[PDB]
Amino acid sequence: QEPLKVAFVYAGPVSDAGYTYAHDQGRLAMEKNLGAKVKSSYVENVPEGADAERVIRKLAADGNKLIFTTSFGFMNPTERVAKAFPNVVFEHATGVKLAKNLGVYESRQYEGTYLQGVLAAKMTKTGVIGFVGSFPVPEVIRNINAYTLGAQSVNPKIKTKVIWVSTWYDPAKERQAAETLIAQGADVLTQNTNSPATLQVAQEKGKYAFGCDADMSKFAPKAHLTASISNWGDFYTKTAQAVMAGTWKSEEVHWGMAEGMVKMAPLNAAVPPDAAKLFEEKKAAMVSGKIKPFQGPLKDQSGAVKVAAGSDLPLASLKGMNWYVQGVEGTIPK
Ligand SMILES: Nc1nc2[nH]cnc2c(=O)[nH]1
């Protein structure tokens, strides 16, 4: 068989050392695993809307038979190109739109974020943890709520302050947002943006933060408590193999810590032994499915019950999550 032409569309740069870096490490793992059977290429820094549609269409027109579109913002462009290219397989990250030649895939990174919350509660001195958000889409709201629930499993009085930058990647805006969270009393920060900017600010101010999608400890060795690492390579390999073998079908795929898509970086030396022990126990329980981030009981911020004790939040509620747990608030606007 001719080598399978595979293309990756990134919303950011491979030099983000975060989200796009991790997707690109997955492409390179697919190339290592499948060798001469695959020929990969990529496009970085692709904007949303008309630009994304033009890039995706050009890759399909040039003979790519499998195209990964790695941003939420590529959802509608991917759906429109997939209709025009019925002999090409499309895989869209974090989306909810499917077709005969369009699948969707995502990680359960919120499993990792829950464990970051457990550690944040152990390491905070203010009792206020902070979150740099991109856009209020379900991926990000699940991470905000999981961070908060993980912290509240240690200290039920924890408060989570959220600031929004309306971008997935802008190191200058991310830095400003991290400065504002620390000014408003957050002392352990996480994010759903894509740069190490928040970590660099945390180190400058003597605060803590987490790496996102990759180990970011080299950017901020004193501030980096751990990181929720995204391993896409096994998924990209499996998908490329399926297309080559004629077994591919449209489905919604979500992998977490049990499937190896989500891993934690080693703990910072500053984490005391009581905190490290709890973290390792909760990590083992998360991998085994003994605990789930959205196990009941859960209430929203209006006091409405979302999940009773002894139940887990349903898949439909996870997929569309647009509500907050008690203790989530915004920053005062600058
Ligand atoms: N985490 C995350 N980062 C992104 N960067 C650009 N698009 C995305 C996305 O959908 N999710």
Author numbering: 27 to 360
Published text:
Here, we describe the characterization of the periplasmic binding protein AtzT, including high-resolution ‘closed’ structures with bound ligands. Primers were designed to amplify the gene sequence without the sequence encoding the TAT signal in order to facilitate heterologous expression. The X-ray crystallographic analysis shows that AtzT is a two-domain protein, with each domain containing a central β-sheet of 6–7 strands, with 2–3 α-helices on either side of this central β-sheet and a C-terminal extension of about 45 residues. After identifying the unknown compound binding to AtzT as guanine (using a combination of X-ray crystallography, mass-spectrometric analysis and SPR) and searching sequence databases for the sequences of homologous proteins, we believe that AtzT is a purine-binding protein that can accept 2-hydroxyatrazine (and possibly atrazine) from the environment when it is present and guanine is absent. The structure of AtzT allows us to classify this protein into cluster B of the solute-binding proteins.
Between the two domains we find the binding site, in which clear density (>10σ) was seen for an unknown compound in both the original 1.87 Å resolution SAD structure and the subsequent 1.67 Å resolution native structure. Mass-spectrometric analysis allowed us to determine that the compound had a mass of 151 Da, and fragmentation analysis of this compound led us to believe that the compound was guanine. Guanine was placed into the electron density, where it refined well, and the resulting hydrogen-bond pattern to the binding-site residues satisfied every N and O atom of guanine. The guanine ring is packed between (sandwiched by) Tyr45 and Trp194. Every possible heteroatom of the guanine appears to engage with the protein. We note that Asn218 is in an unconventional rotamer [180° rotation to rotamer 3 (t-20°) in Coot] and that the interaction with the guanine amine is out of plane with the atoms of this compound. As neither of these scenarios seemed to be likely, we decided to model the Asn218 in the unconventional rotamer state, which allows a hydrogen of the side chain to interact with the π-cloud of guanine. Additionally, the Asn218 forms a hydrogen-bond network with Asn169, which is oriented within hydrogen-bonding distance of the Glu165 backbone carbonyl.
